[PDB]
Design a protein around this nucleic acid. Structure first.
Lengths: 80, 97, 92, 105, 100, 80, 106, 97
DNA sequence: GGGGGACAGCGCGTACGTGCGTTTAAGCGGTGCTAGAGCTGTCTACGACCAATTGAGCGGCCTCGGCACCGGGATTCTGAT
DNA sequence: ATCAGAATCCCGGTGCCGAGGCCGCTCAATTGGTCGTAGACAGCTCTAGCACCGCTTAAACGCACGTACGCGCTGTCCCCCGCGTTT
């Protein structure tokens, strides 16, 4: 199922007003979903590459944070 | 039947918290985030020291290499104060032998 | 206007995941289905992906907000997002 | 018999850091004062981070340090935000900040 | 008779088209070398320099300034203007994250 | 001596024309010189630190490449 | 007798890459097929770079590769622009690009 | 009295150049730029392979580690082209072994 | 010297903020099971190390020809008409 | 639409200095041999990922309505710009 519509426009509205926006256009949501799809098409692909390299098929959180720090987004949290 | 022994610094994190804040507690995910920060800073300084040792064609890392790595990686006075106290952290390391 | 800025001030203090975790998990599984078939995901991996994606898009949203403020406007535009991705280097 | 951590005046394990540096494949030979200096630097950074977290914890009357305190204490400092620029904190967020044009008139 | 004067902006686009197909250093070499020595005098005195170091510094600074001017022009075009402004420069810097 | 006047107005004008700028304001030059000073006082300071580690008082181009690749500005040129 | 470069048919060296991997403090144990893989990857990347540079040189009626040809070759290719994003090329410049609103009005 | 024996790829890149474009020359500045490019991408792939060996807690780098490093660092169809040419290079090297 | 461009003011209207009924499925939580991550044993093929050998990689010289440079013809926008 | 007028592209004459070919050294790749050792593979276990489903309700969809800001237009006033002269 196509779950890109699962990111509803009230959720994108709450996320945008979290960042400090008071007026959000209606066309913001489509490009926001596209950028989220690009980010989850890169990072999860890198995690799939790590999990395939590890002779596994369960995606761990350490592969996720490895993909995040590979692209320059260092994350402190799950995995260690 | 334990699985494996962990490799973290949570007891040392709690001890450092006890020297700084004797009355303030810590949570588990805060210690996980702090341990991730410790590991990232350790990897950054170790990689910078390894690169700087490879630049001068030296296979041995001394205290001067990691002093220069701390100077390069850390801006502001946070390196420079670490220039001083870490040096005397060397000195009473050498005075205790 | 007033209630929007009031919940903005509330939401600069709050920290919960605004994206519901089940549709985001379904989207993650849907995207990962294209790369490798029959994949499993740890829950901490999904939570880390959710937190990092939310932080990245919040940074993109505040970049969009400052771009729209610079354009003598207050309503954001998709071209602000395009300019932010172009200057940020995230646009291929 | 006697640990190298207390002989160096520190508390972090110098032997663990030296063992991690030895098999971490950074150099053929590892010196003695370099892991001591590394332990001193990370101990000072840990002390600064934890004391700013204690500042943020006593700002909101909390006797337990949460990562909200870490998020509010890693971004208010200009030097720590300069060092940790692209660093993402789990269960974090943004500082409370509103632009001047967004204020009501 | 009146002298032949081109329109304001046509000459500017003419040297944009000339300088987008050029591989020369717009900054003069010896004032840039004096500036590099003056900057390095703040950190450590009696420092010697290779000419290749000065040329590499000049090329990197010129490329960084060209990219900064490109982002500034993008910000000025986004602000419905053809003239760049200092606010465009600080906007491109804070999007790039170069302001600490 | 001060070499802020060494970066002349036609030099910044040519750098803006190479960047594709149709019209240049008069206050562009001061902030452009300031950003140049910031970038130079980062890169040259890192090069001085690299030279000071190498027990030398001569700043070579290889340390300049080291300082440029430390900040993420990869350069293929003099030094190697 | 026979070198490993001619054994795998690759122009790029294998013994030099293997020595650099062994003495580069990368790993304790270094494989045998990995320097061959690295030499093949370097040879193909070099061949693609010089092929695009030769296309740019024959576009400009030149038989010698100037760095302007490298600038027109790397930045025009989207894979080389994406991978070598922060790479500054010495003695180069920018692609010929003028914005639509900066064009003169007709 | 020679100074030192340097390390460069002046012969190999020229050999590939004459393999592809026999009528095209190259300058020494472009030779230095190309050598710096080759050395930098080699350093990137070596660092990725070392980090991936430490990722699996392994002291040995095999062909699969550099396969994964090429698949990760290179985007587009050049990654799978390099994977195919590396697999055929490994089989033709082991067949000639 | 000036003229186009940044900036300020004012009306259009529409597009998004706000409120509420309604639907939509998100969230919490017991249950099983089972594929698979991880741990343990073995032994083995692959790699580090020592030493003699060599042939290709690199320093030095050269001579030449590809491109640097000049002017005059032709082209091509370009302002005034 | 239509005019000449400067900026620039191109072609021929020529010249000149880095670039590749050659000479010759020399040092790291090559190969033979040996011993260490990390992991390939197979059983064994135990664990959480996934699927499921019922109850409660948080929240999204969407319609109605409103009003305030993008935006088109107009006026203004001045800021660099093209060009001439001097350092």
């Amino acid at each position: 199922r196509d779950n890109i519509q699962g990111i509803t426009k009230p959720a994108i509205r709450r996320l945008a007003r979290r960042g400090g926006v008071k007026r959000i256009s209606g066309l913001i949501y489509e490009e926001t979903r596209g950028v989220l799809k690009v980010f989850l098409e890169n990072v999860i692909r890198d995690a799939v590459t790590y999990t395939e390299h590890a002779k596994r098929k369960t995606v761990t959180a350490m592969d996720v944070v490895y993909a995040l720090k590979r692209q320059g987004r260092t994350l402190y949290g799950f995995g260690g | 039947k334990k699985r494996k022994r962990k490799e973290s610094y949570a007891i040392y994190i709690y001890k450092v918290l006890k020297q700084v804040h004797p009355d303030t507690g810590i949570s588990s995910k805060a210690m996980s985030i702090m341990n991730s920060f410790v590991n990232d800073i350790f990897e950054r300084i170790a990689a910078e020291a390894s690169r700087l040792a490879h630049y001068n064609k030296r296979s041995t890392i001394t205290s001067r290499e990691i002093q220069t790595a701390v100077r390069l990686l850390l801006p502001g006075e946070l390196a420079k104060h670490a220039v001083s106290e870490g040096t005397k952290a060397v000195t009473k390391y050498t005075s205790s032998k | 206007g007033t209630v929007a800025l009031r919940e903005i001030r509330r939401y600069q203090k709050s920290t919960e995941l605004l994206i519901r975790k089940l549709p985001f998990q379904r989207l993650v599984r849907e995207i990962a289905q294209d790369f490798k078939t029959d994949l499993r995901f740890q829950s901490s991996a999904v939570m880390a992906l959710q937190e990092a994606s939310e932080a990245y898009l919040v940074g993109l949203f505040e970049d969009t907000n400052l771009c729209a403020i610079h354009a003598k406007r207050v309503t954001i535009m998709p071209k602000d997002i395009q300019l932010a991705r172009r200057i940020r280097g995230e646009r291929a | 018999a006697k640990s190298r951590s207390n002989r160096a005046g520190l508390q972090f394990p110098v032997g663990r850091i030296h063992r991690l540096l030895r098999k971490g494949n950074y150099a053929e030979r590892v010196g003695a004062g370099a892991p001591v200096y590394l332990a001193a630097v990370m101990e000072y950074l840990a002390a600064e981070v934890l004391e700013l977290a204690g500042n943020a914890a006593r700002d909101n009357k909390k006797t337990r340090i949460i990562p909200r305190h870490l998020q509010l204490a890693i971004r208010n400092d200009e030097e720590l935000n300069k060092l940790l620029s692209g660093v993402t904190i789990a269960q974090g967020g943004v500082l409370p900040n509103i632009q001047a044009v967004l204020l009501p008139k």
